């Protein structure tokens, strides 16, 4: 029923290693570009 079983599991192992590599890296670029804004400080100067 599954002649592709061993190949599927090998591709799954490569996928697990590959996504374990690239989730933190893409998260790091997202945190870079969004830590532009996540340290933004806003202030108000009404003339009263």
Ligand X SMILES: CCCCCCCCCCCCCCCCCC(=O)OC[C@H](COP(=O)(O)OCCN)OC(=O)CCCCCCCCCCCCCCCCC
Binding residues (CB under 6 A) for ligand X: these are 10-11, 14-15, 18
Q: Taking the complex as a whole, how short is the minimal distance between the CB of residue 16 and ligand X, in angstroms?
A: 8
Write down the least CB distance from residue 22 to ligand X, Å. Answer: 7
C-alpha–C-alpha distance, residues 35 and 20, integer Å: 22
User: Measured from the CB of residue 9, what is the shortest distance to ligand X in angstroms?
Assistant: 10
Alpha carbon distance 40, 48 (integer Å): 25
Q: Which letter does DSSP use for residue 47 in this model?
A: -
Cβ closest to ligand X, residue 5 vs residue 41: 5
């Amino acid at each position: 029923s599954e002649p592709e079983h061993d190949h599927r599991k090998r591709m799954g192992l490569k996928m697990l290693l590959m996504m374990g590599l690239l989730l933190p890296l893409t998260y790091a670029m997202k945190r870079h570009k969004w830590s532009v804004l996540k340290s933004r400080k806003l202030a108000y100067r009404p003339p009263k």
